[PDB]
Amino acid sequence: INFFEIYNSLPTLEEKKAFESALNIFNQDRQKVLENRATEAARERWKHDFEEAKARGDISIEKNLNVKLWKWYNEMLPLVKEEINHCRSLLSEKLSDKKGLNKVDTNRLGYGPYLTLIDPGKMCVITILELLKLNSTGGVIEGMRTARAVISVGKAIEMEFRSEQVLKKILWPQSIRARIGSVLISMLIQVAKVSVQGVDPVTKAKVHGEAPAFAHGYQYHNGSKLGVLKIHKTLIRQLNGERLIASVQPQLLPMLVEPKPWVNWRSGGYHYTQSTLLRTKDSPEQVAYLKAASDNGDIDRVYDGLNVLGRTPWTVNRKVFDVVSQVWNKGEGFLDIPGAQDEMVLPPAPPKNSDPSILRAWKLQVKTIANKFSSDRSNRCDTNYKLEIARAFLGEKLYFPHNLDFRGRAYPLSPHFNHLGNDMSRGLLIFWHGKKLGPSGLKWLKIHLSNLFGFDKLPLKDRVAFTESHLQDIKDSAENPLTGDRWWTTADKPWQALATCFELNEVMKMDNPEEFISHQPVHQDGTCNGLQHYAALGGDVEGATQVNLVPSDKPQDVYAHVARLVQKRLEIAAEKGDENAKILKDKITRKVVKQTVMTNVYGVTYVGATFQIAKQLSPIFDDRKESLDFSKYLTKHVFSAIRELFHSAHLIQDWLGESAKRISKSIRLDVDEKSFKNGNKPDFMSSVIWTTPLGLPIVQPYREESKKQVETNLQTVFISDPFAVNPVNARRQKAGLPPNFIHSLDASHMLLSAAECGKQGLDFASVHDSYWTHASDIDTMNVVLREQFIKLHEVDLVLRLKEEFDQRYKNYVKIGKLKRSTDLAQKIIRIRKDLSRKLGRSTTLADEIYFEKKRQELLNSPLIEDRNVGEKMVTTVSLFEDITDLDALELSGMSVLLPLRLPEIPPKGDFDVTVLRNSQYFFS
Amino acid sequence: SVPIPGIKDISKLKFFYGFKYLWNPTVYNKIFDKLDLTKTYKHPEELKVLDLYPGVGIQSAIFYNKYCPRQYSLLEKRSSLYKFLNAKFEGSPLQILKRDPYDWSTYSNLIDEERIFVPEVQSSDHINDKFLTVANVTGEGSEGLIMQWLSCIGNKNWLYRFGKVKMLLWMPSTTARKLLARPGMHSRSKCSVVREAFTDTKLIAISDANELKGFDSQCIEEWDPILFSAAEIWPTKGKPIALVEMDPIDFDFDVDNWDYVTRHLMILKRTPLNTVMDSLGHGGQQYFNSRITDKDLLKKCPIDLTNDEFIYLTKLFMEWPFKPDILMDFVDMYQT
RNA sequence: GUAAAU
DNA sequence: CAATTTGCATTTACCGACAATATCAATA
DNA sequence: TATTGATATAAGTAATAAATGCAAATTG
Ligand SMILES: *O[C@H]1[C@@H](O)[C@H](n2cnc3c(=O)[nH]c(N)nc32)O[C@@H]1COP(=O)(O)OP(=O)(O)OP(=O)(O)O
């Protein structure tokens, strides 16, 4: 059924409201059935399939696959019951401390209580689905890696146990998950049977036989063993023939009921499925900090912004869907779709008595061909799954609940089909609600078409003139999308341009353009968002002017400026002998310098710029494989040109990086109750934490993960422990502080703007930097954007950041060396010797830290006696407070506990941020 | 004839790329007396001989002086050693070249296209009396080169298309210990298996006396190594240096399937053979239990197995109807 | 590796 | 301290990345 | 009596020392 067309045909708005209410109350049940995962339902499905196929007959079909799965479960259940009974019989007084071989000692007590809780059949279904779900994953040709399989089984059992528990605490360690998974997987290896057919090398005749469906094994890769589970080829073909995705768990799909509003981090998004506000991969510190902030109640605005982002309804486009369907039905590769590849082709076997270079080349050719074939197959499967979702959800309300990564940027829950996808997935989505085009709708729609061609740096007048100069082309391209002028496929973003051409054709055909109702979103794309935020932070003038902060009637583009600078530099340098200039002088385009310049302020080294320009030079005819010399030369020249172009941003970058370096090399006082045991060098357990204006706390996890071997029934898996703590990473914190800070400031701005737009009754959809609204409400959206950016950047954010660092890392001690000839060093030596000569220890730094903590406890408490004692108690840290120039103090030696100081803020510029209210050419 | 270098000239050099060399002519004299080169090579005058990684070249000079072969060629790419050899052996009948032995293109171009050094192809029945090769791969991380040459022995493509070419190879003591293990020892691995299958080597010289504990004590008697002090090698710091002689022998098995079986049966070494056959493929354990009738074989660990029963296991595995992609995989395991 | 953002 | 070394901007998602396992050594 | 730390595995995506691509960093 096509509910969208019925809604559009509704004459009266009251009728529309009644229809929406009826649709929601009817579709609650459909959402409930769509959201629920099928384990027990899979059980009776398999049972019914087996009982119905027992009467009809026996074949080798998908029904036969379900029958054999039912038989596998039926044979599993006695084994699981026997194992659980064996575990339960051990719960009596534990007479033997170390007898019963090693299984009883190391595994029976290890995972006894864990298996006895969940129902056996649920775990059997979980493991069967888990193994039949991840065929050919992790680099294995026809199987999965053992560690990934066992860990996934353990986590699935965790989720099932928690789902049972809430309908009636603790989260299991990684080792327990690994052991449970290994036990179940080994049992299924034992009990898996399937009939196979093959040829005999002696009889040359078919010999029917039975072999286990799953078989453990090991494979090598560059001198490293790698455990692997293998699946028989017959099961592989049956899984391939099992439609596309029928029994393999579909878990995350767009909703139909309006999403549940966010109130706390645990409750949000889907109705009956738990969700989290932050996508914490494996870190517990982020979860703890987010829970503390939510309990305090300082993230309300984030909740409102996410609710507004997830409250907008979507529909699947119809004409674009028809075009995609007609392109896909040809079974080939279009400009965008890679296509479907039929067969796998290989070069013939070379003679073994040939030079080893020939064999090596043949091996590389085979590997490359296999990788290309598999990449094409994966892309085809992804596009096919997207099209299946689009066809299934055609003509019905779609809602996209959102979350935030640890920085704060918003991403939808639906991973496969969402508005952040590629151009094909972006074309297939339009707003459910329709708005009156109005006097300004035509202009903005024409601007959108103009800037989907790449013409986004032209004045609005030039853009509308260009759009109106191609009315015949638009009409021809929209009247027959395929087998015609093919003008839409020449766009920079083809399918969005096709949809906008449809909308323009309809509005041109209409006699009265003002009353036309259009559902097409209009992309208002921010220009150099990172540079804009850097200019707003530092308060620069020239940097603000070059990034369209100041009001002007003509676009200013930094990427074009740097491209022209590079071209002039090379032309001056091309006179004598620069053959690299001969190859690349006029062939320098805005894209390469755009990428390099835009990433430069985040700390891109030479290798990153080289790789970026090499990637953006491959389709520029220079070469297909070897462009590294040209790329290196161009990176050198680009760095030489940009070294002086940005100055205010670089100071903030350097300050943030050095602050990250200082924080990541500091040890606190309180948690040092247990000595670091190295005598001299402690282990650092401090990570950069800061709070954005929206209140969301960002904790850079960036920890050095240590992996160990934990014994399992199958093998010993090499895994890490997420719950376990460990020292932070030295380089990642410094390398990621400024990118994270800039990528969180714009996310905060987007959240504020979305909240205001929702308060103003608008439809808002934001792809990170860019924001989508209707073609009519663009003016109000722009006003809201400017107002909210002004409110966000009316304060010196870096000053508040330094204040937050000072308040949080208040009593932190760094370790550093001092010159022995210094009088202060001699005083510190005298104090340490006087304190620790009678105690016995050789003035160990741990005792000094403990006594400094004691001084902090005494002299900071408001007790008069405690204050007097603190005045009568002096330590190394307490003594070293006379001079505020800690760096200038030090400028062999003995290390002491230097206090943690952060550098002075870079000088804030004299620029008025408010001026951009009239700067129309700032975000468009 | 050819002036042998001395210790002072060697110490004047700066970089040796980690390769350890011996520089006393007495040890080379006794090694050549004991080694019995002249018995296998009926006419050393007509012998055409190739040398790999010469370096110092003292052994080169001693060999040429004592035997006077038809053509003895030095293949080097290291700059300092090449300059040293060019300076010392100026105008010598010794042929100094500048090519890198690591690349197969070096041998291909030097033999086929350029025809500078053309050995004569003989039958694979007896030792090629007209061709001899010498290698000095003593680098820390250059074990892969030796192992690839060992594989090329079986495959017969690199230099063994000419027949049963004898090699006098210098290798680190640990590599020799890995490559000279006997069934039941704790140093047994696939490298030892391929060495035993393709060649019948005999250790000749070894630096560290205490290092002899690693090898099988039974075989030391008929090997009779020549012991020389650790201070004899110029790069005194580093691991000991051993010598092995390579004599390829005829084989009656298929290299690819035997290699697959030995590689997948050496991952689990200490596990009994009863439960390790499952690693070969789906259901291989049942078939191998049915086919094998020697129970002592099933009670033996893969370390205890010698190459004969490895060939046997390969033969049983060929007749198995439900064999996996042993060759149909075509060495496609992982791209990353 | 491919797509998405700066 | 001058000489040698290490990794290479951040994020999300998806597929085929995710240095890993087994056996012999040392210690609590 | 377990519990850790060490080492080989494969075998062209090498090693070495040269000369960086350039900080920014151990470290000997
Ligand atoms: O070029 C990549 C690619 O071939 C492969 N690779 C890495 N991650 C994946 C993945 O998730 N899926 C597939 N199919 N292939 C993958 O590894 C090659 C080399 O990677 P790098 O060593 O450059 O490391 P990284 O993944 O971080 O590279 P990049 O994506 O930042 O360029």
Short mmCIF file of N, CA and C in Angstrom, two decimals, chain B residues 125-194:
data_model
loop_
_atom_site.label_atom_id
_atom_site.label_comp_id
_atom_site.label_asym_id
_atom_site.label_seq_id
_atom_site.Cartn_x
_atom_site.Cartn_y
_atom_site.Cartn_z
N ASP B 125 70.62 -37.91 -11.67
CA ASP B 125 71.01 -39.18 -11.07
C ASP B 125 72.16 -39.02 -10.08
N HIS B 126 73.21 -38.31 -10.47
CA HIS B 126 74.40 -38.15 -9.64
C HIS B 126 74.69 -36.67 -9.44
N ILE B 127 75.66 -36.39 -8.56
CA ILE B 127 76.04 -35.01 -8.26
C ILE B 127 76.61 -34.37 -9.51
N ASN B 128 76.15 -33.16 -9.81
CA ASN B 128 76.66 -32.42 -10.96
C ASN B 128 78.13 -32.08 -10.73
N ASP B 129 79.02 -32.79 -11.42
CA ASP B 129 80.45 -32.59 -11.23
C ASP B 129 80.96 -31.32 -11.89
N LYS B 130 80.20 -30.75 -12.82
CA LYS B 130 80.63 -29.54 -13.52
C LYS B 130 80.09 -28.26 -12.89
N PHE B 131 79.24 -28.36 -11.87
CA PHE B 131 78.63 -27.18 -11.25
C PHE B 131 78.67 -27.31 -9.74
N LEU B 132 79.13 -26.26 -9.07
CA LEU B 132 79.15 -26.19 -7.62
C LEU B 132 78.75 -24.78 -7.20
N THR B 133 78.05 -24.68 -6.07
CA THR B 133 77.62 -23.39 -5.54
C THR B 133 78.06 -23.26 -4.09
N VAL B 134 78.42 -22.04 -3.70
CA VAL B 134 78.84 -21.72 -2.34
C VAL B 134 78.03 -20.53 -1.86
N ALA B 135 77.50 -20.62 -0.64
CA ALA B 135 76.70 -19.56 -0.05
C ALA B 135 77.19 -19.28 1.36
N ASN B 136 77.00 -18.03 1.79
CA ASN B 136 77.48 -17.57 3.09
C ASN B 136 76.39 -16.75 3.78
N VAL B 137 75.19 -17.32 3.86
CA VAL B 137 74.05 -16.62 4.45
C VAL B 137 74.07 -16.77 5.96
N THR B 138 74.78 -15.87 6.64
CA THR B 138 74.89 -15.88 8.09
C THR B 138 74.17 -14.70 8.74
N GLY B 139 73.35 -13.97 7.99
CA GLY B 139 72.66 -12.83 8.55
C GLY B 139 71.63 -13.23 9.58
N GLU B 140 71.27 -12.26 10.43
CA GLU B 140 70.32 -12.52 11.50
C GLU B 140 68.93 -12.82 10.94
N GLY B 141 68.43 -11.96 10.06
CA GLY B 141 67.11 -12.10 9.49
C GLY B 141 67.04 -12.74 8.12
N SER B 142 68.13 -13.34 7.64
CA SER B 142 68.19 -13.89 6.29
C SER B 142 67.96 -15.40 6.27
N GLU B 143 67.21 -15.93 7.24
CA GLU B 143 66.86 -17.34 7.22
C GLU B 143 65.87 -17.66 6.10
N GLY B 144 65.05 -16.68 5.73
CA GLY B 144 64.08 -16.90 4.67
C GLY B 144 64.73 -17.23 3.34
N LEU B 145 65.88 -16.61 3.06
CA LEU B 145 66.59 -16.91 1.82
C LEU B 145 67.03 -18.37 1.77
N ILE B 146 67.58 -18.86 2.88
CA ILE B 146 68.00 -20.26 2.95
C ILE B 146 66.79 -21.18 2.79
N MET B 147 65.68 -20.85 3.45
CA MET B 147 64.50 -21.70 3.34
C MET B 147 63.92 -21.70 1.93
N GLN B 148 63.95 -20.56 1.25
CA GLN B 148 63.47 -20.52 -0.13
C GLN B 148 64.38 -21.31 -1.06
N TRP B 149 65.70 -21.25 -0.83
CA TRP B 149 66.60 -22.10 -1.61
C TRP B 149 66.33 -23.57 -1.35
N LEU B 150 66.04 -23.92 -0.09
CA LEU B 150 65.70 -25.30 0.24
C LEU B 150 64.43 -25.75 -0.48
N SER B 151 63.43 -24.87 -0.55
CA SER B 151 62.22 -25.20 -1.31
C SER B 151 62.52 -25.34 -2.80
N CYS B 152 63.37 -24.47 -3.34
CA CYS B 152 63.73 -24.56 -4.75
C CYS B 152 64.48 -25.85 -5.05
N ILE B 153 65.15 -26.42 -4.05
CA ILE B 153 65.73 -27.75 -4.22
C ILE B 153 64.65 -28.75 -4.64
N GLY B 154 63.53 -28.76 -3.91
CA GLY B 154 62.45 -29.65 -4.26
C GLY B 154 61.76 -29.28 -5.56
N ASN B 155 61.54 -27.99 -5.79
CA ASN B 155 60.80 -27.56 -6.97
C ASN B 155 61.64 -27.60 -8.25
N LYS B 156 62.97 -27.57 -8.14
CA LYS B 156 63.87 -27.68 -9.29
C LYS B 156 63.76 -26.55 -10.32
N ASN B 157 63.69 -25.31 -9.84
CA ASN B 157 63.61 -24.18 -10.76
C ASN B 157 64.68 -23.10 -10.70
N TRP B 158 65.38 -22.98 -9.57
CA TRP B 158 66.22 -21.82 -9.33
C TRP B 158 67.62 -22.06 -9.88
N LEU B 159 68.26 -23.14 -9.45
CA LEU B 159 69.53 -23.58 -10.02
C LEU B 159 69.61 -25.09 -10.10
N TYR B 160 68.62 -25.81 -9.59
CA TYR B 160 68.64 -27.26 -9.54
C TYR B 160 67.99 -27.90 -10.76
N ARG B 161 67.54 -27.10 -11.72
CA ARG B 161 67.21 -27.65 -13.03
C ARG B 161 68.44 -28.24 -13.70
N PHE B 162 69.64 -27.80 -13.31
CA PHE B 162 70.88 -28.36 -13.82
C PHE B 162 71.19 -29.73 -13.22
N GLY B 163 70.49 -30.13 -12.17
CA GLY B 163 70.70 -31.45 -11.59
C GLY B 163 70.94 -31.45 -10.10
N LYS B 164 71.89 -32.28 -9.67
CA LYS B 164 72.18 -32.50 -8.25
C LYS B 164 73.33 -31.58 -7.82
N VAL B 165 73.01 -30.29 -7.74
CA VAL B 165 74.02 -29.27 -7.47
C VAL B 165 74.35 -29.26 -5.98
N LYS B 166 75.64 -29.33 -5.67
CA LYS B 166 76.13 -29.36 -4.30
C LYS B 166 76.37 -27.94 -3.80
N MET B 167 75.93 -27.66 -2.58
CA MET B 167 76.13 -26.36 -1.95
C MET B 167 76.92 -26.51 -0.66
N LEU B 168 77.87 -25.60 -0.44
CA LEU B 168 78.57 -25.46 0.83
C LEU B 168 78.08 -24.17 1.46
N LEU B 169 77.20 -24.30 2.46
CA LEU B 169 76.43 -23.17 2.97
C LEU B 169 76.85 -22.83 4.39
N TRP B 170 77.17 -21.56 4.61
CA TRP B 170 77.42 -21.03 5.94
C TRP B 170 76.11 -20.48 6.50
N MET B 171 75.75 -20.93 7.70
CA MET B 171 74.50 -20.51 8.32
C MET B 171 74.72 -20.33 9.81
N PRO B 172 73.88 -19.52 10.46
CA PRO B 172 73.97 -19.39 11.92
C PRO B 172 73.68 -20.71 12.61
N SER B 173 74.22 -20.86 13.82
CA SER B 173 74.11 -22.13 14.54
C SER B 173 72.66 -22.50 14.83
N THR B 174 71.82 -21.52 15.16
CA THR B 174 70.42 -21.83 15.44
C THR B 174 69.69 -22.33 14.20
N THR B 175 69.97 -21.73 13.04
CA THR B 175 69.37 -22.22 11.80
C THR B 175 69.81 -23.64 11.49
N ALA B 176 71.09 -23.95 11.72
CA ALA B 176 71.56 -25.32 11.52
C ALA B 176 70.89 -26.28 12.49
N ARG B 177 70.71 -25.86 13.74
CA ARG B 177 70.06 -26.72 14.72
C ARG B 177 68.61 -27.00 14.33
N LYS B 178 67.90 -25.97 13.85
CA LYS B 178 66.55 -26.19 13.35
C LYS B 178 66.56 -27.11 12.14
N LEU B 179 67.54 -26.93 11.26
CA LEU B 179 67.59 -27.65 9.99
C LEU B 179 68.23 -29.03 10.10
N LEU B 180 68.77 -29.39 11.26
CA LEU B 180 69.43 -30.67 11.47
C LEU B 180 68.85 -31.40 12.67
N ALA B 181 67.54 -31.36 12.82
CA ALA B 181 66.87 -32.06 13.90
C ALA B 181 66.51 -33.48 13.47
N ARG B 182 66.43 -34.37 14.45
CA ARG B 182 66.03 -35.75 14.25
C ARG B 182 64.66 -35.98 14.87
N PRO B 183 63.93 -37.00 14.40
CA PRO B 183 62.61 -37.29 14.99
C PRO B 183 62.71 -37.51 16.49
N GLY B 184 61.78 -36.90 17.23
CA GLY B 184 61.75 -36.98 18.67
C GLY B 184 62.40 -35.81 19.38
N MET B 185 63.27 -35.06 18.69
CA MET B 185 63.91 -33.91 19.31
C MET B 185 62.92 -32.76 19.45
N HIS B 186 63.26 -31.81 20.31
CA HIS B 186 62.41 -30.65 20.53
C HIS B 186 62.64 -29.54 19.51
N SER B 187 63.63 -29.68 18.63
CA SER B 187 63.89 -28.70 17.58
C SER B 187 63.26 -29.09 16.25
N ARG B 188 62.52 -30.20 16.20
CA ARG B 188 61.91 -30.64 14.96
C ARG B 188 60.83 -29.67 14.50
N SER B 189 60.81 -29.39 13.21
CA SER B 189 59.79 -28.53 12.61
C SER B 189 59.69 -28.88 11.13
N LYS B 190 58.87 -28.12 10.41
CA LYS B 190 58.70 -28.38 8.99
C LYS B 190 59.99 -28.14 8.22
N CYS B 191 60.84 -27.23 8.69
CA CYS B 191 62.11 -26.99 8.02
C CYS B 191 62.99 -28.23 8.06
N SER B 192 63.04 -28.89 9.22
CA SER B 192 63.77 -30.15 9.31
C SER B 192 63.17 -31.21 8.40
N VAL B 193 61.84 -31.26 8.30
CA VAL B 193 61.19 -32.26 7.47
C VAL B 193 61.54 -32.06 6.00
N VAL B 194 61.48 -30.81 5.53
CA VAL B 194 61.79 -30.55 4.13
C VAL B 194 63.27 -30.78 3.86
#
